[model samples]
Target: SLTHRKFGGSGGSPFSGSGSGLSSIAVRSGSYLDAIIIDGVHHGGSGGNLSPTFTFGSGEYISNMTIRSGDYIDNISFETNMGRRFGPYGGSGGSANTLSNVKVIQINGSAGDYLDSLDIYYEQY
Candidate 1:
């Protein structure tokens, strides 16, 4: 979960960042990594490394989740540098509200970035 930058303001309310409590949760078994993907500058002819914020777990059968945070499953839809649709399933919600073999991948924005609240919960094995 990313830290809440702007409070209850025009930009948007504080998501399940740090201070915000994590509500509405669901889980399954599988690996998941979700986040706001940004178009980066591609160097050479190789694919630009888009190691955006992502959560991953191996040996887990997690399928779906609804984290208190925002945009769990990011529906990636963008135009590539060469004008191509590059979509991938990177963002997926939590797992059964509990992280057994799964863990969330959260990144803190720039310095000004901060959260009003934080919430984290996982199902019991």
Candidate 2:
């Protein structure tokens, strides 16, 4: 799963990043959600060093989420179908978004220098 910038919207929504499993989500961050990488692509910005990859387990998939917030996105975490969880990858502060569950096959969003919004699609595992 690899591409550059723009997920969803008029640029067009990408189905998924991989031809195989949607096995990884890599995020570039520090203080804010700098970039979000599904498998390999990014949210339109300078993507270099990244935070830990939210590697998915076999037959396991995303369930719920908690998006940390500040003036922008502070960090985020993912919880899986198996009760497994992976992290808040950026700085912590301000309000937060505890999200609903989804099987997670497609992802789209508004991203600037930092992530603004996110969309999810269900399928596969």
Candidate 3:
């Protein structure tokens, strides 16, 4: 049996004064796992971008972020912030963003197996 969890994001910005941070956490099999957290706030008047990403499953056999046999992920959270802006051009701030390609599958050893429910939520600010 194996339980794996990953969290992270890219770091950089086309503009000098704009960027943000990244972080994640997880709970599996009744144990809480500390996420790999990294802070990349503006330093010396420069900052990095947090590239959003989340994936489950491996190999060419796996298409999309799939939940295969014996795999369970719940209350998973992914977050990102565009950070601060530059100058006083008084232009619009960053807009909301989201993209996803996911798959969920369940298989039972014997017959009379079915999925009760699957819930997915997306929120932006």
Candidate 4:
């Protein structure tokens, strides 16, 4: 029962600067989350160390920023450090990390079921 949900580009940009902040609340619960532009097409990144599985055609590219593995994680931080230039009309957004899709794989080395791995897609957007 997904209540209070909005869809199909209600707003103009789909993404807002407000959504691009440090989210310590998310990783605390250990639930996989995927966030996209607020009211636009689904374009964002994944958490953990997983890379992007999907990509664009000839006019597309990607880069891996970071990969981390450990027993405990207090929280995860993501940010946009640089921007990419596509062409004349459009270039990559500046200094803003957009996270769109997130998925958690099977966990191992735990009592019963613990977080064994995290799949992150930094080049998604």
Q: Which of the numbered candidates is closest to the native, going by highest TM-score?
A: 2
Model 3 segments beyond 4 Å from truth? Answer: 1-23, 30-63, 69-118, 122-125
What is candidate 4's lDDT per residue for 77-125, written digit by digit as tens? 3322222321111112212222332221111111112222233322232
Weakest 10 consecutive residues of candidate 1 by summed lDDT: 107-116
Model 1 ranges off by over 4 Å: 1-33, 37-71, 80-82, 91-125
How do the residues 57-121 of candidate 1 rate in per-residue lDDT, one tens digit apiece?
24222222222223232222222122223334333432222133323223122111211122333
Count of backbone clashes for each model? 23, 1, 2, 9
Best by lDDT: 2
CA lDDT scores, all candidates in order: 0.25, 0.64, 0.20, 0.24
Give the per-residue Cα lDDT of candidate 4 at 37: 21
Q: Residue 119 deviation, candidate 1, in Å?
A: 21
Candidate 4 residue 50 C-alpha distance from true site, Å = 23
Q: For every model shown, what is its TM-score relative to the native structure?
A: 0.19, 0.67, 0.15, 0.21
Single out the weakest 10-residue window by summed lDDT for candidate 2: 3-12
Give the per-residue Cα lDDT of candidate 3 at 102: 25
Q: Predict model 4's lDDT versus the native.
A: 0.24
Lowest summed-lDDT stretch of 10 residues in model 4? Answer: 103-112
Residue 72 CA displacement from its true place in model 2, Å: 3.1
Answer with 1 or 4, whichever has the higher lDDT. Answer: 1
| Model 3 error, position 121 (Å) | 3.6
Please provide, for model 2 over 1-125, each residue's C-alpha lDDT reduced to its tens digit, 9 standing for 90 to 100. 32222222233223345544477888887776777888777774564358767777788887777777644556778888999887767777646766455566656666666665555555422
